Amino acid sequence: SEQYPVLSGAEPFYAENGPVGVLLVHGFTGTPHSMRPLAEAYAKAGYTVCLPRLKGHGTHYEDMERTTFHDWVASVEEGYGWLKQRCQTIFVTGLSMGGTLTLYLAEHHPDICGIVPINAAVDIPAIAAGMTGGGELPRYLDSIGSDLKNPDVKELAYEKTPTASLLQLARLMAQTKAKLDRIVCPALIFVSDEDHVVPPGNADIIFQGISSTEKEIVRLRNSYHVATLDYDQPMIIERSLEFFAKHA
Ligand SMILES: *[P@](=O)(CCCN=[N+]=[N-])OCCCCCCCCCCCCCC
């Protein structure tokens, strides 16, 4: 029900190739742009890929305000279902809330062959901190600045963040965190040492909470939050390809 046009570079991306699929999920207020280089690299290597645009994302923040986390889940379920028609083995990877949605999916779908969450969020104390300051909360908050080490990169993201959406995110994370123990599939967890948006300790929470026997944390020493576009991008791609091949 978006009323604004999809921004250039924020379109969903599909590639139909082999019988192994990768679903790529972008983050909160973010767009497919943050995940596109990964998507193209995986498609080139012969994977069928689906990079959806989350409902209310990549248009305008007014559109986002109307959406709930169930809408964002539905956008990822559509992508999953699209892969399931073309693929017998499926991996899911995501940045930030895209990582949260990756964990969410694996909690609901045991058939998922492996997950690659990247700076995934299950606990962001800054949200409660902003809600408890005593002041009237604006309907729309000025968004946190783009967090990248590479100075020449610009994340495509909303300049304002609806308060309603932030509350929706907090609810999504709370449920996702609570059910981490349902995940048993292999997990490759990337975390930026210097993430100024999602506390790096989230990676430890996820690592300890999931029940997976095959799990690993890989630390990114040359990236901030938006690692998929940052200096460690080629290593993320290389390590993920290794992970997919090992489990495909
Ligand atoms: P990821 O999904 C990447 C999106 C880029 N960051 N943003 N936004 O991050 C998920 C969590 C969103 C950032 C959490 C910080 C929000 C803190 C604001 C709380 C309200 C304070 C205003 C008074």
Residue numbers in the entry: 2 to 249
Reproduce text from the manuscript describing this model.
H257 in its free form and in complex with different substrate analogs and the natural substrate 1-lauroylglycerol. H-257 (bMGL) in free form and in complex with inhibitors. Both MGLs possess the expected α/β-hydrolase core domain harboring a catalytic triad. The occurrence of different conformations reveals a high degree of conformational plasticity of the cap region.
These structures were determined at resolutions of 1.85 and 2.2 Å, respectively. The bMGL complex structures with the C14 and C16 ligands bound in the active site show clear electron densities for all residues of the cap region. Interestingly, chains A and B of the bMGL·C14 and bMGL·C16 ligand complexes show a partially restricted binding pocket and an open glycerol exit hole similar to conformation II. Chains C and D of the bMGL-C14, and bMGL-C16 ligand structures show even more pronounced restriction of access to the binding pocket accompanied by the closure of the glycerol exit hole denoted as conformation III.
